[PDB]
């Protein structure tokens, strides 16, 4: 019924601009992966802990590809766009990835 978080971490969410060929900010935010038991669903929701506005609300899908580029930088391709998270700490990155991969395992 409600949204149940399975992890939380600080990161700067960015989108890879294939054209400008650069990595651009989507706008640190708080990143959480929520799960809906009443729908067996998982989402990546990033909120601006400043003005508390949601910057990202992404559904981790069935065939998603999560890549841990660096100890503090991870990305994932949906099938038509790539997202990356510049973490605030290796620790928070380690935490977010275990959840992510775990959520993806369930996703399958």
């Amino acid at each position: 019924m409600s949204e149940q978080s399975i992890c939380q971490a600080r990161a700067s969410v960015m989108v890879y601009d294939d054209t400008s060929k650069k990595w651009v900010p989507i706008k640190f935010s708080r990143i959480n992966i929520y799960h809906n038991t009443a729908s067996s669903t998982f989402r990546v929701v990033g909120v601006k802990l400043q003005d508390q506005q949601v910057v990202i609300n992404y559904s981790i899908v069935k065939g998603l590809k999560y890549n841990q580029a660096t100890p503090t930088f991870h990305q994932w391709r949906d099938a038509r766009q790539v997202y990356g998270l510049n973490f605030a700490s290796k620790e928070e990155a380690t935490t977010f990835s275990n959840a992510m991969l775990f959520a993806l395992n369930i996703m399958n």
Binding site: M14, Y16, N67, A69, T70, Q75, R77, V82, N86
Partner: peptide, 7 residues
Amino acid sequence: EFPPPPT
């Protein structure tokens, strides 16, 4: 694949 990260 995924591009090279920033830096």
